[PDB]
Amino acid sequence: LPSGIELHNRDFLTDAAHLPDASIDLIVADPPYGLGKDYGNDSDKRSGDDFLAWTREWLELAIPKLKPSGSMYIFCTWQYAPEIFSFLKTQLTMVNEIIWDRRVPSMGGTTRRFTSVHDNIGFFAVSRAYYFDLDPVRIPYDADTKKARSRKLFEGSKWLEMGYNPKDVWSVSRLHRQHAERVDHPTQKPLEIIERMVLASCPPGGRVLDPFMGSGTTAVACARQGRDFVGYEINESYCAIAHERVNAL
Amino acid sequence: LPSGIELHNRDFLTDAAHLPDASIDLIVADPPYGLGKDYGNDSDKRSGDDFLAWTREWLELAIPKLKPSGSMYIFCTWQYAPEIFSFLKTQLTMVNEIIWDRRVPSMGGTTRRFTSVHDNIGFFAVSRAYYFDLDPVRIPYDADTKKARSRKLFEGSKWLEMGYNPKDVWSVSRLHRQHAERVDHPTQKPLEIIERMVLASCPPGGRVLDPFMGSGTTAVACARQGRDFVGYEINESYCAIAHERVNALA
DNA sequence: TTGTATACTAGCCA
DNA sequence: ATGGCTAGTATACA
DNA sequence: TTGTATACTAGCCA
DNA sequence: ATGGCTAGTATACA
Ligand SMILES: Nc1ncnc2c1ncn2[C@@H]1O[C@H](C[C@@H](N)CC[C@H](N)C(=O)O)[C@@H](O)[C@H]1O
Ligand SMILES: Nc1ncnc2c1ncn2[C@@H]1O[C@H](C[C@@H](N)CC[C@H](N)C(=O)O)[C@@H](O)[C@H]1O
Numbered sequence: 001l002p003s004g005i006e007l008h009n010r011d012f013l014t015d016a017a018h019l020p021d022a023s024i025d026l027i028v029a030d031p032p033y034g035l036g037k038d039y040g041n042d043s044d045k046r047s048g049d050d051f052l053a054w055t056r057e058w059l060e061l062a063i064p065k066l067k068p069s070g071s072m073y074i075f076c077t078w079q080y081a082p083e084i085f086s087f088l089k090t091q092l093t094m095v096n097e098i099i100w101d102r103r104v105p106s107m108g109g110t111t112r113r114f115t116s117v118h119d120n121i122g123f124f125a126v127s128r129a130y131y132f133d134l135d136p137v138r139i140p141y142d143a144d145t146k147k148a149r150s151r152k153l154f155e156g157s158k159w160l161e162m163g164y165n166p167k168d169v170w171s172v173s174r175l176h177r178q179h180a181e182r183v184d185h186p187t188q189k190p191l192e193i194i195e196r197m198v199l200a201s202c203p204p205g206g207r208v209l210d211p212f213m214g215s216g217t218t219a220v221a222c223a224r225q226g227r228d229f230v231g232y233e234i235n236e237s238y239c240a241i242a243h244e245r246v247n248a249l
Numbered sequence: 250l251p252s253g254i255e256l257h258n259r260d261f262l263t264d265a266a267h268l269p270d271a272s273i274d275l276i277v278a279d280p281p282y283g284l285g286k287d288y289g290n291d292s293d294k295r296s297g298d299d300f301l302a303w304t305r306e307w308l309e310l311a312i313p314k315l316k317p318s319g320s321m322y323i324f325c326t327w328q329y330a331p332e333i334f335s336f337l338k339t340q341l342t343m344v345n346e347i348i349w350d351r352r353v354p355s356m357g358g359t360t361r362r363f364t365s366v367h368d369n370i371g372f373f374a375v376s377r378a379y380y381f382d383l384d385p386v387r388i389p390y391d392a393d394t395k396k397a398r399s400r401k402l403f404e405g406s407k408w409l410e411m412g413y414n415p416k417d418v419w420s421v422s423r424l425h426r427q428h429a430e431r432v433d434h435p436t437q438k439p440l441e442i443i444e445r446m447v448l449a450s451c452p453p454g455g456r457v458l459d460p461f462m463g464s465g466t467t468a469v470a471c472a473r474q475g476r477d478f479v480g481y482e483i484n485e486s487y488c489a490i491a492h493e494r495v496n497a498l499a
Numbered sequence: 500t501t502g503t504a505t506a507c508t509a510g511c512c513a
Numbered sequence: 514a515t516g517g518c519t520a521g522t523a524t525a526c527a
Numbered sequence: 528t529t530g531t532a533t534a535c536t537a538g539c540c541a
Numbered sequence: 542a543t544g545g546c547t548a549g550t551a552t553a554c555a
């Protein structure tokens with residue numbers, strides 16, 4: 001197991017003490033949305049006030065671990081995003097609401113509403129001096145698109161010559177079960193977006209915390225990009241998968 | 250103007266009393282977001298708790314105007330979306346969060362955050378039997394794409410033959426200044442979006458309300474598709490532009 | 500091919 | 514407890 | 528070219 | 542109070 005990367009088969013809400021206050025530059029949180037999924041446990045079986053209470057509980061434990069320059073990304077569903085973001089705006093300051101456009105809509109069979117195709121990500125910061133580096137995550141143009149975008153007014157601009165801001169909508173397709181990156185986990189997140197977070201909001205060598213790491217996608221991002229990692233996952237199968245994913249680099 | 254198209258150059262909060270309760274089938278609300286724009290007035294000059302108080306004010310005026318079958322779309326910025334939606338969930342039930350992907354990001358020059366390219370839209374309903382008709386808003390495939398999506402298992406499915414759900418992310422570019430649609434209004438909304446909303450959530454001939462109609466995009470949307478319209482705008486020039494836009498269809 | 504505006508600059512330093 | 518200066522910001526319409 | 532799974536049906540009726 | 546049954550749900554991986 002590489003150095004700096006640290007995986008625990010433990011519940012975060014109980015081991016939070018083992019984590020020094022103000023030791024983490026970035027929290028990458030993909031917690032249970034409150035949607036009834038089966039992680040081999042009932043963590044995503046909560047809902048309503050129950051789920052939101054649990055959310056704010058683990059959040060109150062996690063926040064004090066952020067150093068003053070720290071930041072946080074938190075995934076959730078629109079069904080609970082208003083309440084969650086409202087609570088977090090009392091503690092931290094919201095820098096962005098990033099929309100993950102999964103490209104592939106949820107199934108079921110409804111015709112009474114619009115089908116789900118996005119997840120919500122709150123991007124919060126402790127203080128106004130939060131760390132943020134755009135250059136590693138700039139998206140470079142290809143020959144054709146740069147040609148289509150180039151104008152003398154824009155020539156030499158950083159966004160045109162180096163690459164543009166990924167913007168607060170990320171259109172990255174969800175991972176097909178047969179996708180090469182896919183592992184046996186119900187709600188695995190594309191490494192693309194997690195790497196974007198690690199790169200833009202964690203300095204090289206900084207420490208990232210994933211209190212609900214699942215298959216360890218954030219562990220992989222940190223390993224590939226030279227960041228330190230800490231992760232918690234109550235399911236040992238997912239934890240072993242994370243070990244595997246990391247050691248294969 | 251056509252038949253069921255009522256354009257009132259009146260402040261909505263003083264004139265909502267005139268509109269009968271349980272009169273409106275759909276509310277298409279694009280209120281000021283609280284970002285500091287200039288509509289010839291200080292409506293968007295509010296911010297923070299004072300802006301959220303004014304939002305609650307006009308919302309409390311507008312909700313009772315909904316028939317038990319009615320619905321509401323509300324445009325907002327991620328900056329005030331959590332509080333506004335949190336408050337609306339206590340008055341109505343949320344059916345969707347629609348993300349308008351504007352394709353063109355906001356300018357400025359920042360480097361210390363991700364650039365704004367999406368507006369938030371809350372889709373709420375009074376009761377669990379709200380009126381929703383997906384067929385008129387379905388998006389049919391072209392030939393090549395229908396060939397790429399067809400499979401024996403899918404053949405005959407309504408989504409493959411008639412059209413697929415727009416989903417809760419609508420990718421539609423903002424109206425360029427020189428765009429045909431565009432008029433002299435700072436925050437004009439694409440007719441595609443507004444029309445999708447009107448067609449999916451207002452019964453033909455029903456009444457839709459626009460507390461702040463601006464250029465009357467919703468007015469056009471209802472004129473075509475044959476729906477009734479009541480809109481309010483305090484700017485006489487915006488009301489003028491709306492009058493023109495409506496008296497140019499057919 | 501190209502000009503150009505579109506709901507959502509910000510950190511210093513004074 | 515405010516400004517102003519700087520380096521900086523994409524797409525798609527006509 | 529084709530099979531196939533993917534964080535988020537929903538109303539009725541025995 | 543509880544299944545089961547219905548009509549029904551898009552893309553992009555391999
Ligand atoms: N108290 C808890 N402590 C640690 N893990 C938990 C806890 N509660 C739920 N979990 C796990 O958190 C994970 C949430 C997942 N969304 C993580 C997915 C992860 N982003 C991935 O790419 O694989 C699940 O695997 C849960 O089993
Ligand atoms: N009390 C008020 N009553 C009526 N209109 C108002 C009021 N306050 C602000 N407005 C107007 O609300 C409008 C908000 C706009 N975003 C509407 C845009 C509109 N959807 C369009 O396509 O043009 C502005 O034009 C304001 O002039």
Ligand SMILES: OC[C@H]1O[C@@](CO)(O[C@H]2O[C@H](CO)[C@@H](O)[C@H](O)[C@H]2O)[C@@H](O)[C@@H]1O
Nearest residue numbers: 089092093094095296297298327328329
């Ligand atoms: O959490 C930041 C978030 O709050 C908003 C409105 O909800 O602004 C509020 O908080 C700001 C903190 O920087 C204050 O400056 C502002 O006065 C207050 O309204 C959003 O602007 C912002 O995204």
